[PDB]
A paper describes a structure:
Telacebec inhibits the mycobacterial respiratory supercomplex composed of complexes III and IV (CIII2CIV2). In mycobacterial electron transport chains, CIII2CIV2 replaces canonical CIII and CIV, transferring electrons from the intermediate carrier menaquinol to the final acceptor, molecular oxygen, while simultaneously transferring protons across the inner membrane to power ATP synthesis. Structural analysis of the CIII2CIV2 supercomplex from M. smegmatis led to the discovery that a dimeric type C superoxide dismutase (SOD) is an integral component of the assembly. Each CIII contains two sites where redox reactions with MQ occur: a QP site near the positive (periplasmic) side of the membrane where MQH2 is oxidized and a QN site near the negative (cytoplasmic) side of the membrane where MQ is reduced.
We then incubated CIII2CIV2 with both DMWH2 and telacebec to produce an inhibited complex and determined the structure of this complex to a nominal resolution of 3.0 Å by cryoEM. Telacebec binding did not cause large-scale conformational changes in CIII2CIV2 but produced a clear density for the inhibitor in each of the two QP sites in the CIII2 dimer. The inhibitor’s imidazopyridine moiety, amide linker region, and A-phenyl and B-piperidinyl moieties are all resolved clearly, with weaker density toward the end of the tail, which points into the lipid bilayer toward the cytoplasmic side of the membrane (pale blue surface). These densities show that telacebec binds with its head group deep within the QP binding pocket in a pose similar to UQ and the UQ-analogue inhibitors bound within the canonical CIII2. Telacebec’s imidazopyridine moiety forms multiple interactions with the protein to stabilize inhibitor binding. Although hydrogen bonds cannot be detected with complete confidence at the present resolution, the position of the N1 nitrogen in telacebec’s imidazopyridine moiety is consistent with formation of a hydrogen bond with the His368 from the QcrA subunit, which also binds the FeS group (dashed teal line). The 2-ethyl group from the imidazopyridine is ~4 Å away from Ile178 from the QcrB subunit, providing hydrophobic interactions (dashed green line), while the 6-chloro group from the imidazopyridine is close to the backbone carboxyl group of Leu166 from the QcrB subunit, enabling formation of a possible halogen bond (dashed purple line). Thr308, which is homologous with M. tuberculosis Thr313 and is known to be important for binding, is <4 Å away from the linker region of telacebec. Although the rotameric state of Thr308 is ambiguous at the current resolution, one of the rotamer states could form a stabilizing hydrogen bond with the carbonyl group of the linker region (dashed teal line).
Numbering used by the authors:
A (entry chain V): 13 to 157
B (entry chain S): 1 to 203
C (entry chain P): 1 to 13, 22 to 50
D (entry chain T): 1 to 139
E (entry chain U): 1 to 79
F (entry chain R): 10 to 561
G (entry chain Q): 27 to 338
Write the structure that this text describes.
C-alpha cells in the first residue's frame, strides 16, 4: 500500500486526501475539454433513452481482449445493464461488452454498428470522435427497458 | 421509520449541550445586546452633545420633567426585570407553566411601562415640548422612544415565546429561548436605568 | 413516523415518451412539464 | 473558554483607557470641553466589550475545558450530537422583504407603508421563530 | 484639449493594452495536456468512463453486493 | 483497480436545482457564493458609476453630466463600493470559508446568516433605488455631512432611500457579525484551540467585533438623521453641536468601517502567502496581536478625518493614527517574511496577493503622510485623499478579493479558474489601477479637491485627468477577462478532483473534498498546529514544522 | 528637484505655508525611502522563485523570528515618533492667534459662493482707523407671550431660547466683497501683512481652500456652538498677485462653482482699494482704480448652463 508519490495522505475514514502542485491539473486526460464534454453528453443524456449505463475504456486491454473487456465491465457500477466500449489504440483493438439486463433491446445488432463507427473514426484519425459516434449509435440502438 | 433515525425527543433541541459547552443562543444574544448598547450609545451621544449646547437651563422653559409618572415607570421596569428573572428560574426547570406565569406578569408590567411612557409623552407634548419644537424635546423623545421601541420589541418577544411554549413540548431549546429573551429584557431595563438617571436625575 | 405513504393512481394521457424526461423534470408524468423550445424562441 | 473571554478583557481594558484619556484630554485642552460624542461612544464601546467579556468569563469559569479549548485533543473527543442547526428555511427572505417594506415606508414617509411593513415583519419573525415548533395540524 | 484626440486615447489605450496583454498571455500553452495523437503510443493510464445515467435505487453502497458481471454479449474490431 | 468516473463533470446541473435553494438555502457555502456574486455585481455597478464620473472628469466642461448627476454619481459610487460591495463581501468570504477553517459543519445561526444576506441585498436595492426617483440618488457624498443631509439641503427622496437602505444593510452586517463571532467562539473542531486557527478566522472575528462596535452607531446616526428629515427633529441643528455631532458619530462608525473592510482581506492574503511560499505564515502570533491592536486603535482614532473642521483634539488623534499605522507595518513585514526564502510560485492568487502588497504599500505611505494634521490641511478633502484611500482600498478589497476568489474558487466550485486569463486580468488591473490613481496624488496636491464635477480649462489638471480616464477604462476592460474566466470556469474549466488545488495548502479548508461536502467535512485531521492540512498531506514535514519554527 | 519631489505643491506664499511644505517634503523623503526599501524586499523575495533545480526540499519553514520582529516593531515607533514631533512643532505654527492681527477678513461662505467683509484693518505702522459695522446681526428670539395653547406655554425657542434660523453668528461688515454666479469674488489683501480669516458659513458646512496657502479650514454653520476654530491667522503673504481658491468641502450641487480669488496687493495698493471701496464702488471698480484687472484672472465664473449639450 502507498498513497500518491507525494502530498496525498490517507485520512481517518477511507477517503484519501490528495493534493497537486499549484501549476498542474488533476484530471490530466489527453483530450480537449470540449470533446470530453461532448463525450460526457453522449454518455449521459445521449444514453438516457437507452436506460443502459454506457461506459468507455480508452486504456489498453491486452491479451485476450474479450476477457479483459469483461473484467473492465466488472468495474462499471451496474455491469448487468451496461454497455462498455473498450478500445486500445496500442493494439488497434475494439471490444464491446454488455450484461444480462441489456438483452433483446437491440444491443446485439447495434454491437457491430457501434464497433464499425468507432473503427471508421479511428482509421480516419480521431479516437474521441469515434468514441462519441459509437456511444451515440449504440445508445440509439438500445431501446429503453 | 421503525423508531427514529435521530434519537431526539423533539424536532428541535438545544443548539449545544449547555452542560459542558457554551449555549450558542445565549452567546449570540449577548453579542447582539452588546451591539444594541452601541446603538443606544449613539443616541446618548446625541443627547449629551445637545446638553452641552444649552444656555445653562438644559430642560427649556416649556418643558418640565414629570418625576411623578417617571419614577413609577422605572420602578415597574425593575419589577418586570425581577419577574423575568424568576421566569428564567422556572425555565431552567421543566416548569413551563411557571415560566409562562412569570413572563405573562413581566409582559403586563412592560406593557404598563409602555402605556405610562405614552401618557407622559402626551402630557409633555400637550405642555409644549415636542420633537420639531426644540432640541431638548427632540433628543429626549428620540432616546426615550427608541428605548420604547426596544421595550415593545421585548413585549413582542415575550408574546412570541409564550406562543412557542404553547405550541410544543417545553424542551431545553425553549428554556434557552426564555433565557435569551430574559437577557434582552434585562438589557432593556438596564439601558432604561441609564436613560432615566441621565434624563431625570443627572439632567 | 406520524405519516403514511401515499398510493396515487391517476389516469395518464402525447404519451410523454418524447419531450421532457423525468431526470430533468422529476414529475414529468404528473402533469404538463414541457414547453417546446420553438414556441419559447418565437 | 479562557481565550475568548481574555480577548474581550483586553479590548475592555484598552477601550476604558482610551475613553478615560480622551475625556481627560478633552475636558481640558479643548475649545468646548468634553466632546460628549467621542467620549460617550468610547465609554459605551467599552461597555459593549465589557458585556461580551463578562459573559465569556462567567461561561469560562462555569465551563470545564472543552476539546475546542484543549491542546492535544483528539477529534474523537469532540464527537457527539451537535445541537440543532436550522435546515432550509424561506422565512429569512420574507423577514428581509418585510423589513425592506418598512424601510421604504420610513424613507418615503408613508405611515401606511410603515405600518404594513411592521405587520409583515412581525408575521415573518413569527414564522421564523415558530418554524421548528409548529406542532402537527390536528384538524 | 483636442476633444477628439483625448477621446480616442481613452477609448483606444485600454483596448490596445488589452490586445497586447491578450497576445502575451492567451497565446501561451495551457496546462491542459495536448490531444493524444493516434500514431503516438497510448501513454496515459487506463481510463474508464461511465454515464452515471440510470438511477442506482439506493444511494448507500451497502446492500448493492456483487451478484454477477453476467456478460450478455460481445463484439470486436481492428480499426 | 480503476474507478468509473465521468469524462467531464456536470457543467450546469439539472434544471431547477438552484432557485429554490437560493430562496431557502441555509448552508453557509451557498450563501457565501451568493454574497460573492451579488457583491461583485454591485462592484460592477459602482465601477460603472466611477467610469461615468471619470468620463465627465476627462474634460473641463460638463460634457454629459449635470452637477447634481455627477454628485449623485460619486455619492452612490462610494456608498456602493464601501457599504454594498466590501463590507458584504468580507462576510461573503466569511460564510464561504470560515466554518471550514475552524472545522465546523455550518455557521452558528444559519437562518440568521441567510437573513443577513437577504437584508443586505434588499437594503442595497432600496439604496440604489434612489436613482430611479426623478430627483435621483443622494447628492451628499458618501460621508453625508449633517447640514447638507437635512431636509432643507438635499430634500430629495433619494436621500431618504439612501438612509434607510444603509440602515437595512447595517442591520444585515450586524447580524452577520453576531453570527460569525458566535461561530468562531462556540463552533470549532475538537483540536482547534483558539491560538491555532487560521489567520483569516482571527481577522474575521476581530472584524466582527469591530462591526458590532461601529455599525450600531451608523444605525443610530442614520435613524437620527431620518428623524431630522421627516420630523424636523433638531437632532443635528448646526446651532447645536449638530454638524460636529454628525461628524463624530459618522466617523466613529466609518473609520472602524474601513478597518473591517481591510482586516478580513489582510487575513485572506495571510492565507495566500504561506501556501505559495511553501512555509508557515511568519509570526502567526504576531499577526493575531497586530490584528487585535489594529482593531483596538481603530475604534479610538476615528477623528483624523476631521482635521480641517478645526473642532477636534488634533494631537490625540494624530498620535493614535501613528499608533495604528505601526501594527499595519508589523503585519506587512510578517507578510514579507512569509514570502521570504520559499519556493515561490506566482500563480494568479499570489500574483494578486503581491499586487496587494505593492499597491497597499503606497496607499499606506499616503496614509502616514495624511496622518499629520499640518499636511492633511493642504491635502484634506482633495484628490490626494482620493488616491490614498483608493490605493489602500483597491489593494485590500479588490486585489485581495481577487486573490481570495482565485484561491477558494476551486474549493467552492470543484473547478480551477484559467491561469492565463488570471495573468491577463491581474496585469490589466494592476496597470489600469496604477495609471488611474497614481496621477491623482499630484492632481489633488495641486489645487483640485474631491467632488468637483468640472474644472476650468484655464486651471491645470487636464492632461492628468485624461490620464486617469485612460487608467479607469483600462480597469473597465480589465474587468472583462475576470468575468469571462469565472463564467467559463464555473461550469467548464480544469476540474480539480483533490484537496489542495494549490498544493502545500493549510488552514484546514483543504482537508475536505474540493467541492466541500454538505457540513464541510467527512474527516478531520489531527489538529496540532496552525496548518492541519499541511501536516496531513505532508506528515514527514511535521517534525520540520516544529524544528525550524523557533529559528526564525 | 524639490518641486518634482514636492508631488505637486503650490509654492507657499505664507511662512506657515513654507513650513508646511518643508514638513511635506521631509515626510515624502521618509516615505519614499521606506517604500523603496519595502519594494526592494518584495522584489528580492520575488526573486526566490521555485527553481527547477530544487528537488523535493521544502523551505526552512522558520517563521517566528522574535529578534527581527522586535526590531521591526520598535523602529517604526521611532519613525512615527520623530514624524509626530515634527508634526506637532509645525502644527504649532498653524494659528499663532496673535491678538492684534494686521487685517481681519470676515470670510462668510454661503451656499454656492463667498463674501468677504473686511472686518477690521489695523496696521502696526500706523493707519487704517477702520472697523466693521455690525448693526446687521439680528436674532430670531421667538419669545412670544403665548403659543398655540391658550396659556402657560409661553414657549421661548427651540434651541437656547432661539430659532435655528437666527444668524446671530453670521457677522456682517461694511465693505462686503460678495461674489455672484457671474462674477468671481476677488478678495484683496496687502502683501507682507498678518491677515486674520474669521470663517463662517451662512447655509451649509463647506471648506475654504487657497491652494497657495497650503492650508484650509471648514467654514462651519455655527463654529462656536460646534466647538470649532473658525478664526485662522496667516502670519504674512509675500508673493503678490492673484491666487485661486476653492470650496474644498461638499457644498451642494454647485460645489464646483464656488471658486473665489485672493488678489494680494501692496499695502499702498490695499489702502487705495479700501478708500475707493468706502466710497460706493464695486470690487471691480476699486480693483481697476488701483490699475489691476477687475475680475478674477486665475478663474472665471464659468457658465451656469447645466452643461454643453443643453440647448442654450
Ligand atoms: C378581521 C378579523 C379576522 C379574523 C380574526 C380571528 C381572531 C381569532 C380567531 C379564532 C380564535 C381562536 O382560535 O381562539 C381559540 C384558540 C384555540 O384554537 P386552536 O385550534 O388552539 O388555535 C390554533 C393553533 O393551534 C393555536 O396555536 P398555539 O396556541 O399552539 O400557538 C400559536 C399562536 C400563533 O399566534 C401567534 O402569532 C403568536 C405570536 C403573537 C404575535 C403578537 C406580536 C404583536 C405584538 C404583541 C405584543 C407587543 C405589545 O396561536 C395562538 O396565539 C392561539 C390563540 C388564538 C389567538 C391567535 C393569535 C392572536 O386559542 C385559545 O385557546 C384561546 C385564545 C383566544 C384569544 C384570541 C383572541 C384574538 C382575536 C380577538 C377578536 C377577533 C378579531 C376581531 C378584530
Ligand atoms: C414578495 C414575495 C413574498 C410572498 C411569499 C409568501 C410566502 C408564500 C407561502 C409559502 C407556503 C409554503 O411554503 O407552504 C409550505 C409551508 C410549510 O410546509 P412544510 O411542512 O415545509 O411542507 C409542506 C410543503 O408543501 C413542502 O413544500 P415547500 O416547503 O417547498 O413549500 C413550497 C412553497 C415554497 O415557499 C416559498 O419558498 C415561498 C416563500 C419565499 C418566497 C420569497 C421570494 C420572493 C422573490 C423571489 C423570486 C425569485 C427570483 O412553494 C411556494 O409557495 C411557491 C410559490 C411562491 C410564493 C411567493 C410568490 C412571490 O407552509 C407554510 O408555512 C404556510 C404558511 C403561510 C404564511 C405566510 C406568511 C408570510 C409572512 C409575511 C411576510 C412577507 C413579507 C412581505 C413584504
Ligand atoms: C427584475 C429581475 C428579476 C430577476 C430574474 C432575472 C432572470 C431570472 C433568473 C432566475 C433566478 C435565479 O436565481 O435562477 C437562476 C437562473 C437559472 O435557474 P436555476 O434554477 O438556477 O437553474 C439551475 C441550473 O441549471 C444549475 O445551477 P447551478 O446550481 O449549478 O449553478 C450554476 C450557476 C450559478 O452558480 C451558483 O452556484 C450561483 C449561486 C449564486 C448566484 C445567485 C446570487 C444571487 C442571489 C439572490 C437572488 C436569488 C433568488 O453558475 C453559472 O455558471 C452562472 C453563470 C456564471 C456566473 C459568473 C459570472 C461572472 O438563471 C438564469 O438563467 C437567469 C440569469 C440570472 C439573471 C441575473 C442577472 C440579471 C441582471 C444582470 C446585471 C447584474 C449587475 C447589476 C445588477
Ligand atoms: C426597535 C428594537 C426592537 C428589538 C427587538 C428584538 C428583540 C430580540 C431579543 C430576544 C431574544 C432572541 O432573539 O432570542 C432568540 C430566540 C431563540 O431562537 P431559537 O430558534 O431557539 O434559535 C435557534 C437558531 O436560530 C438556529 O437557527 P437561527 O439561525 O434562526 O438561530 C435562531 C436565532 C438566532 O439567535 C440570535 O442571534 C438571537 C439574537 C441575535 C440577533 C437578534 C436580532 C433581533 C432584532 C434585530 C433588529 C435590530 C433592532 O434567530 C432567530 O430566530 C431570531 C429572529 C430574529 C429576526 C431578526 C429580525 C430582522 O427566539 C425567540 O424565541 C425570541 C425571538 C423573538 C423576536 C421578536 C422581536 C421582534 C421585533 C419587532 C418588534 C417591533 C417593535 C419596534 C417597532
Ligand atoms: C481599506 C480601506 C482603508 C485602509 C486600510 C485605510 C488605512 C489608513 N488610513 Fe484611511 N481612509 C479610507 C480607507 C482606508 N484607510 C477611506 C475610504 C477614507 C475616506 C475619507 C473621506 O472621503 O472622507 C480614508 C481617509 C483617511 C484619512 C483622511 C484624509 C482626509 O480626508 O483628509 C487619513 C488621515 O488623515 C487616513 C489614514 C489612514 C492610515 C494612517 C491608515 C493605515 O491604517 C494603513 C496605512 C499606513 C501604514 C503605515 C501602512 C504601511 C506601513 C509600513 C510600510 C511600515 C513601515 C512604515 C512606517 C512605519 C511609516 N485615511
Ligand atoms: C471599494 C471602494 C472603491 C473602489 C473599488 C473605487 C474604484 C474607483 N474609483 Fe472611487 N471612490 C470611493 C471608493 C471606491 N472607488 C470612495 C469611497 C470615494 C469618495 C466618495 C465620496 O466622496 O462621496 C470615491 C471617489 C472617487 C472619485 C471622486 C469623484 C469626485 O469626488 O468628484 C473618483 C473620480 O474618478 C473615483 C474613481 C474611481 C475609479 C476610476 C475606480 C476604479 O477602480 C473602478 C473600476 C471600475 C470597473 C471595473 C467598472 C467596469 C465595469 C463595467 C463597464 C461593467 C458594468 C456592467 C454592469 C453595471 C452590469 N472614485
Ligand atoms: C425609522 C422611523 C422614522 C425615522 C426615525 C424616527 C425615530 C423616532 C423614534 C421614537 C419616537 C416616537 C414617540 C412618538 C411620540 C413623541 C411626541 C412628539 O414627538 O410630539 C408630537 C409630534 C408632533 O409635533 P407637532 O407637529 O409640533 O405638534 C405639536 C402638538 N401641539 O409628533 C411626531 O412628529 C412624532 C411621530 C414619530 C413617529 C415615528 C414612528 C416610528 C416607527 C418606525 C417603525 C420602524 C421603521 C423601520 C425603518 C428601517
Ligand atoms: Cu459652499
Amino acid at each position: 500500500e502507498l498513497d500518491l508519490p507525494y502530498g496525498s495522505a490517507l485520512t481517518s475514514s477511507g477517503r484519501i486526501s490528495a493534493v497537486t502542485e499549484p501549476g498542474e491539473l488533476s484530471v490530466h486526460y489527453p483530450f480537449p475539454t470540449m470533446d470530453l464534454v461532448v463525450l460526457d453528453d453522449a454518455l449521459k443524456y445521449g444514453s438516457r433513452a437507452a436506460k443502459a449505463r454506457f461506459a468507455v475504456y480508452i486504456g489498453p486491454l491486452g491479451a485476450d481482449t474479450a476477457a479483459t473487456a469483461r473484467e473492465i465491465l466488472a468495474n462499471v457500477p451496474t455491469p448487468e445493464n451496461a454497455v462498455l466500449l473498450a478500445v486500445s489504440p496500442d493494439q488497434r483493438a475494439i471490444e464491446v461488452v454488455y450484461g444480462a439486463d441489456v438483452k433483446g433491446r437491440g444491443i446485439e445488432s447495434a454491437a457491430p454498428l457501434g464497433v464499425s463507427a468507432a473503427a471508421a473514426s479511428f482509421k480516419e484519425g480521431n479516437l474521441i470522435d469515434g468514441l462519441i459516434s459509437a456511444v451515440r449509435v449504440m445508445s440509439a440502438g438500445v431501446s429503453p427497458a | 421509520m421503525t423508531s427514529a433515525v435521530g434519537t431526539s425527543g423533539t424536532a428541535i433541541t438545544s443548539r449545544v449541550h449547555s452542560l459542558n459547552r457554551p449555549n450558542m443562543v445565549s452567546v449570540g444574544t449577548i453579542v447582539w445586546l452588546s451591539s444594541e448598547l452601541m446603538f443606544f450609545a449613539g443616541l446618548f451621544a446625541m443627547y449629551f452633545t445637545a446638553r452641552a449646547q444649552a444656555g445653562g437651563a438644559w430642560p427649556p422653559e416649556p418643558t418640565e420633567l414629570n418625576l411623578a409618572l417617571a419614577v413609577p415607570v422605572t420602578l415597574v421596569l425593575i419589577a418586570s426585570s425581577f419577574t423575568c428573572q424568576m421566569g428564567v428560574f422556572a425555565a431552567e426547570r421543566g416548569d413551563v407553566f411557571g415560566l409562562r406565569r412569570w413572563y405573562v406578569i413581566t409582559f403586563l408590567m412592560g406593557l404598563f411601562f409602555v402605556l405610562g411612557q405614552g401618557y407622559e409623552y402626551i402630557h409633555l407634548v400637550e405642555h409644549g415640548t415636542t420633537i420639531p419644537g426644540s432640541a431638548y424635546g427632540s433628543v429626549f423623545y428620540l432616546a426615550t422612544g427608541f428605548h420604547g421601541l426596544h421595550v415593545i420589541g421585548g413585549l413582542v418577544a415575550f408574546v412570541l415565546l409564550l406562543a412557542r411554549t404553547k405550541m410544543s413540548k417545553f424542551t431545553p431549546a425553549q428554556a434557552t429561548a426564555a433565557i435569551v429573551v430574559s437577557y434582552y429584557w434585562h438589557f432593556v431595563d438596564i439601558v432604561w436605568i441609564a436613560l432615566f438617571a441621565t434624563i431625570y436625575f443627572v439632567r | 413516523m406520524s405519516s403514511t405513504q401515499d398510493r396515487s393512481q391517476l389516469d395518464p394521457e402525447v404519451e410523454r415518451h418524447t419531450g421532457v424526461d423525468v431526470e430533468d423534470v422529476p414529475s414529468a408524468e404528473w402533469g404538463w412539464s414541457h414547453m417546446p423550445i420553438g414556441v419559447m424562441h418565437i | 473558554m479562557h481565550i475568548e473571554a481574555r480577548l474581550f478583557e483586553i479590548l475592555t481594558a484598552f477601550f476604558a483607557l482610551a475613553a478615560v484619556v480622551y475625556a481627560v484630554l478633552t475636558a481640558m485642552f479643548a475649545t468646548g470641553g468634553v466632546e460628549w460624542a467621542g467620549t460617550t461612544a468610547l465609554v459605551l464601546t467599552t461597555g459593549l466589550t465589557l458585556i461580551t467579556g463578562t459573559f465569556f468569563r462567567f461561561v469560562a469559569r462555569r465551563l470545564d475545558t472543552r476539546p475546542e479549548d484543549y491542546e492535544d485533543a483528539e477529534i474523537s473527543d469532540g464527537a457527539g450530537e451537535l445541537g440543532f442547526f436550522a435546515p432550509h428555511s424561506w422565512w429569512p427572505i420574507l423577514i428581509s422583504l418585510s423589513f425592506s417594506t418598512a424601510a421604504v415606508g420610513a424613507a418615503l414617509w408613508l405611515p401606511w407603508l410603515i405600518a404594513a411593513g411592521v405587520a409583515f415583519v412581525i408575521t415573518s419573525v413569527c414564522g421564523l421563530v415558530f418554524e421548528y415548533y409548529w406542532g402537527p395540524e390536528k384538524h | 484639449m483636442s476633444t477628439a484626440l483625448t477621446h480616442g486615447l481613452i477609448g483606444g489605450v485600454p483596448l490596445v493594452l488589452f490586445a497586447v496583454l491578450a497576445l502575451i498571455f492567451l497565446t501561451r500553452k495551457g496546462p491542459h495536456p495536448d490531444t493524444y495523437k493516434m500514431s503516438d503510443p497510448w501513454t496515459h493510464a487506463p481510463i474508464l468512463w461511465a454515464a452515471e445515467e440510470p438511477r442506482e435505487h439506493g444511494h448507500g453502497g451497502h446492500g448493492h453486493d456483487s451478484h454477477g458481471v453476467v456478460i450478455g454479449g460481445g463484439a470486436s474490431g481492428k480499426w | 483497480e480503476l474507478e468509473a468516473r465521468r469524462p467531464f463533470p456536470e457543467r450546469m446541473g439539472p434544471k431547477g436545482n438552484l432557485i429554490y435553494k437560493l430562496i431557502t438555502t441555509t448552508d453557509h457555502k451557498l450563501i457565501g457564493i451568493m454574497y460573492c456574486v451579488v457583491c461583485f455585481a454591485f462592484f460592477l455597478v459602482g465601477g460603472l458609476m466611477a467610469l461615468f464620473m471619470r468620463t465627465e472628469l476627462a474634460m473641463p466642461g460638463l460634457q454629459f453630466l449635470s452637477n447634481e448627476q455627477f454628485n449623485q454619481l460619486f455619492t452612490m459610487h462610494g456608498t456602493v463600493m464601501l457599504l454594498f460591495y466590501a463590507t458584504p463581501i468580507v462576510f461573503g468570504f466569511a460564510n464561504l470559508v470560515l466554518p471550514l477553517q475552524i472545522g465546523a459543519p455550518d455557521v452558528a445561526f444559519p437562518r440568521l446568516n441567510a437573513l443577513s444576506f437577504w437584508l443586505f441585498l434588499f437594503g442595497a436595492l432600496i439604496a440604489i433605488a434612489g436613482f430611479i426617483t426623478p430627483g435621483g440618488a443622494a447628492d451628499f457624498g458618501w460621508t453625508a455631512y449633517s447640514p447638507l443631509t437635512d431636509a432643507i439641503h438635499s430634500p430629495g427622496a433619494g436621500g431618504d432611500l439612501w438612509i434607510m437602505g444603509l440602515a437595512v444593510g447595517g442591520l444585515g452586517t450586524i447580524l452577520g457579525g453576531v453570527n460569525m463571532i458566535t461561530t468562531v467562539v462556540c463552533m470549532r473542531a475538537p483540536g482547534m484551540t483558539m491560538f491555532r486557527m487560521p489567520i483569516f478566522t482571527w481577522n474575521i472575528l476581530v472584524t466582527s467585533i469591530l462591526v458590532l462596535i461601529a455599525f450600531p452607531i451608523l444605525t443610530a446616526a442614520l435613524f437620527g438623521l431620518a428623524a431630522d428629515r421627516h420630523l424636523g427633529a433638531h437632532i443635528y441643528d448646526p446651532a447645536n453641536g449638530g454638524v460636529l455631532l454628525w461628524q463624530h458619530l459618522f466617523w466613529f462608525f466609518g473609520h472602524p468601517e474601513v478597518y473591517i473592510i481591510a482586516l478580513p482581506f489582510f487575513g485572506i492574503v495571510s492565507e495566500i502567502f504561506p501556501v505559495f511560499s511553501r512555509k508557515p505564515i511568519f509570526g502567526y502570533t504576531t499577526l493575531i496581536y497586530a490584528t487585535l491592536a489594529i482593531a483596538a486603535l481603530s475604534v479610538a482614532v476615528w477623528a483624523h478625518h476631521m482635521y480641517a473642521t478645526g473642532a477636534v483634539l488634533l494631537p490625540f488623534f494624530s498620535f493614535m493614527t501613528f499608533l495604528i499605522a505601526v501594527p499595519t507595518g508589523i503585519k506587512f513585514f510578517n507578510w514579507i517574511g512569509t514570502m521570504w526564502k520559499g519556493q515561490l510560485t506566482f500563480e494568479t492568487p499570489m500574483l494578486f496577493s503581491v499586487g496587494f502588497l505593492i499597491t497597499f504599500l503606497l496607499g499606506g505611505l499616503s496614509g502616514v503622510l495624511l496622518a499629520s494634521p499640518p499636511l492633511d490641511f493642504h491635502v484634506t478633502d482633495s484628490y490626494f485623499v482620493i488616491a490614498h484611500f483608493h490605493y489602500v482600498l483597491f489593494g485590500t478589497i479588490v486585489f485581495a478579493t481577487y486573490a481570495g476568489i482565485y484561491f477558494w474558487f476551486p474549493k467552492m466550485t470543484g473547478r480551477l479558474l484559467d491561469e492565463r486569463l488570471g495573468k491577463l486580468h491581474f496585469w490589466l488591473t494592476f496597470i489600469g489601477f496604477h495609471t488611474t490613481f497614481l496621477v491623482q496624488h499630484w492632481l489633488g496636491d495641486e489645487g483640485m479637491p474631491r467632488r468637483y464635477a468640472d474644472y476650468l480649462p484655464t486651471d491645470g489638471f487636464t492632461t492628468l485627468n485624461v490620464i486617469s480616464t485612460v487608467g479607469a477604462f483600462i480597469l473597465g476592460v480589465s474587468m472583462l477577462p475576470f468575468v469571462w474566466n469565472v463564467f467559463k470556469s464555473w461550469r467548464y474549466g480544469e476540474p480539480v478532483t483533490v484537496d489542495d488545488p494549490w498544493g502545500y495548502g493549510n488552514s484546514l479548508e483543504w482537508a475536505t473534498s474540493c467541492p466541500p461536502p454538505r457540513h464541510n467535512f467527512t474527516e478531520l485531521p489531527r489538529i496540532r498546529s496552525e496548518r492541519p492540512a499541511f501536516e496531513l498531506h505532508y506528515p514527514h514535514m511535521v517534525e520540520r514544522m516544529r524544528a525550524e519554527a523557533h529559528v526564525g | 528637484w524639490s518641486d518634482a519631489l514636492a508631488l505637486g505643491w503650490p509654492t507657499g506664499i505664507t511662512p506657515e505655508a513654507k513650513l508646511n511644505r518643508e514638513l511635506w517634503i521631509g515626510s515624502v523623503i521618509a516615505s519614499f525611502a521606506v517604500g523603496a526599501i519595502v519594494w526592494g524586499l518584495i522584489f528580492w523575495t520575488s526573486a526566490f522563485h521555485r527553481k527547477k533545480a530544487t528537488d523535493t526540499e521544502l523551505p526552512r519553514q522558520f517563521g517566528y523570528n522574535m529578534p527581527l520582529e522586535l526590531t521591526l516593531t520598535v523602529i517604526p515607533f521611532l519613525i512615527i515618533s520623530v514624524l509626530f514631533y515634527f508634526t506637532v512643532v509645525v502644527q504649532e505654527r498653524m494659528m499663532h492667534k496673535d491678538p492684534n492681527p494686521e487685517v481681519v477678513i470676515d470670510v462668510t461662505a454661503f451656499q454656492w459662493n463667498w463674501k468677504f467683509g473686511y472686518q477690521k484693518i489695523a496696521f502696526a505702522d500706523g493707519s487704517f482707523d477702520y472697523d466693521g459695522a455690525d448693526p446687521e446681526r439680528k436674532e430670531a428670539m421667538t419669545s412670544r407671550p403665548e403659543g398655540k395653547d391658550e396659556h402657560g406655554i409661553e414657549k421661548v425657542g427651540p434651541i437656547r431660547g432661539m430659532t435655528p434660523e437666527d444668524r446671530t453668528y453670521l457677522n456682517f461688515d461694511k465693505i462686503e466683497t460678495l461674489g455672484t454666479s457671474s462674477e468671481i469674488p476677488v478678495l484683496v489683501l496687502p502683501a507682507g501683512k498678518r491677515i486674520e480669516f474669521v470663517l463662517n458659513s451662512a447655509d451649509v458646512i463647506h471648506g475654504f481652500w487657497v491652494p497657495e496657502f497650503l492650508f484650509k479650514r471648514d467654514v462651519l454653520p455655527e463654529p462656536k456652538a460646534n466647538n470649532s476654530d473658525n478664526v485662522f491667522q496667516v502670519s504674512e503673504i509675500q508673493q503678490t498677485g492673484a491666487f485661486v481658491g476653492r470650496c474644498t468641502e461638499m457644498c451642494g450641487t454647485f460645489h464646483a462653482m464656488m471658486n473665489f480669488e485672493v488678489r494680494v496687493v501692496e499695502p499702498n495698493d490695499f489702502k487705495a482699494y479700501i478708500d475707493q471701496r468706502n466710497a460706493g464702488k464695486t470690487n471691480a471698480e476699486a480693483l481697476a482704480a488701483i490699475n489691476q484687472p477687475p475680475l478674477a484672472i486665475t478663474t472665471e465664473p464659468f457658465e451656469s448652463r447645466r452643461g454643453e449639450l443643453v440647448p442654450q
